[PDB]
Design a protein around this ligand. Structure first.
Ligand code: CA
Ligand code: CA
Ligand code: CA
Ligand code: CA
Ligand code: CA
Ligand code: CA
Ligand code: CA
Ligand code: CA
Ligand code: CA
Ligand code: CA
Ligand code: CA
Ligand code: CA
Lengths: 146, 360, 360, 360, 360, 146, 146, 146
């Protein structure tokens, strides 16, 4: 690809720090071993959830081309993807996977500076391009990247 | 039992004789300080008073001479009682009698009377020789404190094999009153040491070494400032101006930890402060995230309006809100990590409860 | 409920009257500082202004006299409200009214007006008597902070029995802003104290004790340097030149820990640094061990060649490589021992997880 | 990927331009120091050299003016790259461009050329204005350290959310080389600060404020000694003689902990020392207990012989042996209690092993 | 085995030659100090003695020249023995022989003999060159301590891989005698350093730089006082007056922790003190609660009597008793919370006992 | 009621800090969760006992009108109710729920200053307005509020 | 007895600190409770052994007249009884309850200063007044109090 | 043997510090007791492995003549035996008990300074004096002592 060979090589040992066994891939137990070695204790569910955060093919195992896309978000300073995502996670108070208009009125009307509900209705109307009556995460991501 | 009621009787006698001894030592100090005042401010026409004061100090230290004998003889009698001796020559141990005769010599020190209006040579140092009897103070601190006398203390200490001594009573009064001890030390030094230096140096013609010079000199040497407006001239003044700075370093170095102890929270207060900061930062994350959407929909509104300069103004503030939100989220995560670390020994004892529930 | 809404009303009144009192105290300080400037730099031909300033300070402290009365009367009314009293003579407690009348006297202190161009005797100390009213500042710090007012704090504190007081609010502002408090203390001292010493000593003919001398004298006494270029002459200057070095020792001793706190890693950072040093030292052991074989086979090559001087050169470097390798291996083992000790409480909580899995 | 290889290219460009900038700043410092030497030691007959040096410093700071522009423009280009901007007016943030233009002004500072052999007024402070550019040093410390560049660091730090910043690199170099950093600070201060004070004060006729006076003055103010043999006369000298003692308190207060860290044992060494003291005190208890029986049978021998003076001599030494034996036994018990407390976390992990064996 | 008995023989030889070397170095110091005394107090009519003393110092350092050779040759022979060498050119390593020849030069330093009654120029610094041989002292501290020789130490240290070195023996003597080491350092400095400064500066006509001036100057610079009554004039005196304050900061900073260590309780003493305060505060709560009822029934008695002024007097004291009781109860609860926190690791080991009883 | 709307609102979030789930009430397990979060470990019996301290209706669950009466004692500085109550708890050495005259003679005669038993008999006679022969807690509370 | 009434009273509360229940005596579990409260963990066997150290009647429970004799040894500074006893405990390397002549030769001949075995034989001969061939603890105590 | 009697005696107590029971030998459990007393926790397998490091007769128990040979390596400063041995342990990345030429090319070619494989082939050819095709530990020890 576009990456130079020296840079390919220096990312290879960083990948090797994940594939400690040299299995050709990254597994769940290997990653949890690293997590424990760095002083934090997730569950298998939390590890699996962070896999689901990162697993593009849908295998549960990670390879080097996925790993490059992974570190592409991490090498920069501000993961603007992650910042929008976790702010969305703040919004879903019910864990629905959605932002309802009731959650929207709970947040923006009282807290903030007095945005009118009819303007919030126009916001929700331009917002639900999926027409879901509410905001998805895909709708939210496309919405913030609109 | 018979040597035990006798033991308590003799110990009460020892406490009373430690009281009388402290009173008569403070009286000798009061005699010497006012004698040193009245020789300078009286001149050479009040010699009858100085004669009578010197006889007073002689009888006053004769009494302390009898009292130290009476003290240590009872201490020896205690030591014989504890082991059932009868031959008093045996218990009179070598290091023991050495300390006793050394104390006889050290409290044998006094401004003895010798006799155009000024001093002789030795009688100034012999006047200085009084304040070398200040070692009797922790003895009276020991005996007037009844913790040696109170039996339940001795019972528990014998159970845990801890040996009530001077180091115990010192830490007792230290950690029961941490402020008062340090205050009573520094405030006892800060003026009295300078009075002693005024004894150490005297000029007759110019009057340039008396109280009003050393009372400024010694707190300055104590606080390691060292202006140089007054400087000791003799060598004996130079010794005191070393000991002063030594004690000043000591009091500074003890004061700094006394300041530092009272600053941190209680263990209980820490949970309360952290729990309050939790619900503060939760609402603040709701605030910042609201600012995010508020600017986001305005930028998207001017985007749909294709307002060029409004979008150019808005998107900067958008990114600024993002930058603020990231730092707020990081502070919240750091504090939550502190919470999960503040439930280290807390969750330890919680699972000690659950481990009794695992034993159940 | 009726005494509770009333309680909050009276407390808000108390906060507002603490605000007005702080404003009028700072105004009296501003009056005294500029009066002290204008008497020296104005001379003896601007006496009308000094007369009007003295009347201004008199009315200005009359207002503070009314305000302290209004404050503590409401405090008494609170105390009666909390227990349901009606007889106001009863709640007026002895130590309580003693503190109140003592505060009346301490804030009764002012440069009262008395009348070839120079000062009288008492009116300089009476001018000094203003800055003895600086005790009202933590009162306003308490009341303007709404943590006493905010109810959820009081709820949790009553649950954990922690008693919100001055010591609480002090530690609150201390451990929420550790830099700002220390900065606002030292930067408030470093110049204002010297202005006060300039009030304390004045020479008329030579002008050798005013601002430009004490503004250099007091930071030098504060930092325990003590050159001796300027020295206080009066006794009241000598007192301030003791208090200055006291506060300097205090600020130094508080600054040293503030420096020391920010130096160590986060708990999370320590794992990261150690894990990075692990993979560094692993590769470095591979480096040193490669140097070992590289020199070993060269020495063995010249051994098979029987090259005498080459072997004599090589075997020294061989042993040097061995010596380096030993130290590298020891550093790696020490760090690995640190790792197995850095998984002390970490493995404790890991087996707390495994102990829930032992309860499962 | 395309913005990532570009990112590393731009970052390498930034490191190289930080190298050139540090070189040209040190060169400007070297120009100003030797210009200050040659104006005093050269007199007023070498004005051609001073003219050419002033033109050299002007071009030398013109280059740094171009370099700071080139640096922060690339930083802006990075920031646009990270978010995909195109309009460069948008990323030019207010606080950001404020810091940039402030840095333009601060590095716009230089001894500009103005023109019976002595100085003007402003051109001494303008010569002083060079060493206010020393803030670029930690920037080059950041960028020449490749820990920001090395990717595995960034991977692990993003896993543990630790945010590599200046505070990280500072603690990195601090706790990887604790001696070298403190040495390179104090040894960089101790002479250079005094050279700056020699710039700050100059007397023409007497030559009483040059290098050989301030090189003695500033280590004395630094170590808070304050003799008074040399004293600053101007106010700008008085400011430097405050900052000097500030930095001296700082270096003293950092040096004291660096001394204190290396004193205590390793965790492994403590077990070894305690185990050695165990087998020492065991044999010593055997020694003292042997002395007990040895004196006991001799006293009993002279008892059976009814030797009066021999028994009177012996029984004292008997009781002395008892007194020694008690203290030895107490030291052994205290150390054994330390052992049973030194197997606190040790027995914790031992029963962590036995708790895996309880899970087995 | 044959290289092991030989090893112990050579090591005993090395200890003996370290003893002789320390004796001959102290003798050279004693020669130089009395030579410096006798040149000043003898004048210019005792030149025969000075000639013979210079020849004595020359032979005295010739012997130390032979001794350092004999030492390091045996050290090399040890190093060859440990690895089985035969070619002595090989083991003579570059840094090793560099240190050896450097030590040859440093102990090649001596006041060599040169020849109306006063000194030359170089022979004062050459006289100063003796006390640069004080580095041999920790070598003799190492070798005369038999902990390197005693085998059981080496066995255990090889088991735990701890590497007996100079840092080990230093911490050994430090934490086996914490007072004696600090005392032997400070009391070795406080006078000897001033003697060295008296060598460094001498005035011939006025006699204003000899012993009686530096013996007062150097403890004042050491304690960071800095009067200014005596000030060094030469530059070499200025260097020593920096090193003095450095060592003073060092001794102060080591003394402060030595003071702070002995202050806190034993771990056992803490339980005892807390248990005593428990039964004290229990009885005190019974006291305060008795005062509550005692005043309560009196107020109720005067209530039934309708005594107005008696009730007005009583109810104030009632509320005062309530206020005292609340604070007593809070102290008791804080101490009981300390108890339940003082049974943190105690209950941990108790349930370690109960966890063996859970394994049973 | 007499409380102003802003004050009603600010007590509502304080109540919300107890009803973390928004159940409409306060339960035992919710309160014990708070107790553990603040670093103290009661038993279920201790939690239930503090409920019995505060439960006016007798439900075991707490609502907002009970919570106002609760905080009414706590918002002030000196809970004079609690100070009399725990001093009474000191007195009941046997845990009887009473103060006997023997406990009274154990406390007040020797400890304190020498109050005569016939005066203590008149005290106990005026004290037992319930005529229980001894002091209840209700008798004690009415007695101290007499 | 010979003790004055005030001293009797002040020892009574010290005894009360052991009889925390007021059972009229001191039991094993009460004493172990105190031992745990002071930060040391003995076994039941160690507690029973210290009872056997102190139990004069042979009950396993301790009363006040035994307690006075107990504190009579402890109120003084140097328990010379205990110092001889534990020094004897050092001597019994085998735990036999005896000092053999072999243990005596192990201690005194080499360690110490060279006491001759025939003098040690005369010592053992004057020592075994019980004629046990070796030293008991009673023989040792009577021996040191000879 | 060649050792003098005083030195024999002083090594005897050092040996006695291992044989704490005086069994005449050193066992596994005794050594593990010492290991625990010094603050490190090996397994039985690790203890047995260090026995196999030191056991010359092959008994599993250690006596004094083995102990002298043991301390002969430890009394000196630099255990050059141990330094070569653990450096060999670094080399065996697969745990084979061997150094293959692939491991050799992994180490020395890239890491270090560019030694040519034909020279490495001559090195391996002179190295395999056992002719194993690879390096043993005995081959490695004889190789470094060649
Ligand atoms: Ca893998
Ligand atoms: Ca995948
Ligand atoms: Ca939702
Ligand atoms: Ca609820
Ligand atoms: Ca209810
Ligand atoms: Ca009752
Ligand atoms: Ca009982
Ligand atoms: Ca019994
Ligand atoms: Ca035996
Ligand atoms: Ca054995
Ligand atoms: Ca064997
Ligand atoms: Ca291999």
């Amino acid at each position: 690809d576009q990456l130079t060979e020296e840079q390919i090589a220096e990312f290879k040992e960083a990948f090797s720090l994940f594939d400690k066994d040299g299995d050709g891939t990254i597994t769940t137990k290997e990653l949890g071993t690293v997590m424990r070695s760095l002083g934090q204790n997730p569950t298998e569910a939390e590890l699996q959830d962070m896999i689901n955060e990162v697993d593009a093919d849908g295998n549960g195992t990670i390879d080097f081309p996925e790993f490059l896309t992974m570190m592409a978000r991490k090498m920069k300073d501000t993961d603007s993807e992650e910042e929008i995502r976790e702010a969305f996670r703040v919004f879903d108070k019910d864990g629905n996977g959605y932002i309802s208009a009731a959650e929207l009125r709970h947040v923006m009307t009282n807290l903030g500076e007095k945005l009118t509900d009819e303007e919030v209705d126009e916001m929700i109307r331009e917002a639900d391009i999926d027409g879901d009556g509410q905001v998805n995460y895909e709708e939210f991501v496309q919405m913030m990247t609109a | 039992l018979g040597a035990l009621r006798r033991r308590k009787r003799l110990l009460e006698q020892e406490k009373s004789l430690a009281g009388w001894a402290l009173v008569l030592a403070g009286t000798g100090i009061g005699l010497m300080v006012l004698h040193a005042e009245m020789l300078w401010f009286g001149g050479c026409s009040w010699a009858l008073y100085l004669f009578l004061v010197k006889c007073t100090i002689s009888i006053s230290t004769f009494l302390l001479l009898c009292l130290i004998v009476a003290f240590h003889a009872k201490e020896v009698q205690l030591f014989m009682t504890d082991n059932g001796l009868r031959d008093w020559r045996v218990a009179l141990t070598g290091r023991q009698a050495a300390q006793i005769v050394l104390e006889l010599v050290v409290c044998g020190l006094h401004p003895a009377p010798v006799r155009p209006g000024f001093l002789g040579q030795g009688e100034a140092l012999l006047s200085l020789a009084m304040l070398l009897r200040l070692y009797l103070v922790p003895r009276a601190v020991l005996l007037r404190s009844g913790v040696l006398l109170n039996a339940s203390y001795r019972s528990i200490g014998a159970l845990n094999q801890v040996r009530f001594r001077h180091w115990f009573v010192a830490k007792l009064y230290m950690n029961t009153h941490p402020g008062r001890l340090l205050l009573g030390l520094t405030l006892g030094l800060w003026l009295t040491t300078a009075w002693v230096l005024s004894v150490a140096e005297r000029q007759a013609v110019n009057a340039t070494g008396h109280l009003s010079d050393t009372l400024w000199l010694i707190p300055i040497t104590f606080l390691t400032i060292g202006y140089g407006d007054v400087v000791p001239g003799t060598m004996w003044g130079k010794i005191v101006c070393l000991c002063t700075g030594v004690m000043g370093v000591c009091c500074t170095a003890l004061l700094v930890a006394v300041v530092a102890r009272k600053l941190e929270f209680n263990k209980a207060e820490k949970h309360v402060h952290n729990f309050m900061m939790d619900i503060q930062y939760t609402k603040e994350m709701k605030e910042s995230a609201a600012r995010v959407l508020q600017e986001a929909w305005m930028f998207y509104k001017h985007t749909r309006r294709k307002e060029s300069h409004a979008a150019r103004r808005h998107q900067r503030k958008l990114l600024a809100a993002i930058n603020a939100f990231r730092q707020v989220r990081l502070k919240h995560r750091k504090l939550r990590e502190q919470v999960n670390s503040m439930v280290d020994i807390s969750k330890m004892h919680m699972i000690l409860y659950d481990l009794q529930q695992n034993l159940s």
